[PDB]
């Protein structure tokens, strides 16, 4: 018993050389998040974990996202909370200004949205609804309906619920081989 490090290392290099290739051949997915208290970013990186089971997801803060990209996306996923009165989180105003200025979109990509909110306020998940309504108008096809995780009534539960359903749908419109047999995380049961 045992494997010399120099050997193991060559073996893991073998696996990595293979994952790299199947990964670059998968479909890219962009996950955008905006957040004040960090709950959206956590859910956003959770969405990435789930999407890593069939796609090439990337988690990116709304303020580091260059709109030019909208013209090349295959599937855009958005996870953001709301503040003030239908206001976006801090790191979301930059993209907010843009997305609402934007009058046209040639690449009618696919998108799904999920926003964090709190029933207490009259404008519930208003920012998430704002970007969601705006994207349909621009032409993109709503993969799955917008979800809403109520800070008061089981946010995660709702998230996970939407995370999984939005994923089974993505594996469908994108023709994912072995669709119904993909082993996803344990939290999404």
């Amino acid at each position: 018993r045992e494997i010399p490090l120099k050997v193991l290392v060559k073996a893991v290099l073998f696996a990595c050389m293979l994952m790299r290739k199947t990964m670059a051949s998968r479909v890219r997915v962009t996950i955008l998040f905006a957040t004040e208290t960090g709950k959206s970013e956590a859910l956003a990186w959770d969405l990435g974990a789930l999407f890593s089971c069939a796609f090439n997801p990337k988690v990116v803060c709304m303020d580091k996202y260059r709109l030019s990209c909208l013209e090349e996306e295959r599937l855009l996923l958005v996870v953001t909370s709301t503040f003030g009165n239908g206001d976006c989180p801090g790191n979301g105003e930059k993209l907010k200004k843009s997305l609402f200025m934007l009058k046209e979109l040639n690449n009618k990509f696919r998108y799904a949205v999920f926003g964090l909110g709190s029933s207490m306020y009259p404008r519930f998940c208003a920012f998430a609804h704002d970007i969601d309504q705006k994207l349909s108008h621009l032409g993109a096809s709503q993969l799955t309906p917008m979800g809403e995780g109520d800070e008061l009534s089981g946010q995660e539960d709702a998230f996970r619920s939407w995370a999984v359903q939005t994923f089974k749908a993505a594996c469908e419109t994108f023709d994912v081989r072995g669709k119904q047999h993909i082993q996803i995380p344990k939290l999404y049961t």
Binding site: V9, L18, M19, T22, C53
Partner: protein
């Protein structure tokens, strides 16, 4: 390039995948190790990988197909990134250092539970600056000998 030493290491590396010892690596034996390493390819992707290295199109990978590939991919530039992706598999915290535990973790995940001793040596097996750890520089120097 390619010295009997390197070839022989690639054979033992090959063996790590060919657990049952029949001389071929199956789409099943591949998934097992990749998932052990925290890689999550789908069944259809597993066959892709098997199909890519499978030169005789006979359904599985023998050492020769394995050697054929590794020898080529090694002398290349992509190794840069790939070798580095190989580091991350070990360096879970991405702190730039492969600590003893991390090495333990991967091994236990590979179904290889070792005493804390043989693990600390499995490190000094490439620890240039004797800090009981493997950095990137020492890791890349260990892959390219």
């Amino acid at each position: 390039q390619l010295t009997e030493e390197q070839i022989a290491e690639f054979k033992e590396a090959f063996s790590l995948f060919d657990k049952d010892g029949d001389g071929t690596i199956t789409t099943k034996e591949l998934g097992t190790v990749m998932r052990s390493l925290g890689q999550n390819p789908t069944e259809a992707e597993l066959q892709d990988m098997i199909n890519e290295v499978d030169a005789d199109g006979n359904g599985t990978i023998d050492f020769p197909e394995f050697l054929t590939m590794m020898a080529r991919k090694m002398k290349d530039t992509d190794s840069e990134e790939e070798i580095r992706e190989a580091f991350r598999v070990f360096d879970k915290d991405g702190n730039g250092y492969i600590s003893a535990a991390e090495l333990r973790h991967v091994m236990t995940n590979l179904g290889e539970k070792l005493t804390d001793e043989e693990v600390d040596e499995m490190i000094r097996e490439a620890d240039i600056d004797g800090d009981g750890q493997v950095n990137y520089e020492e890791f890349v120097q260990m892959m390219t000998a």
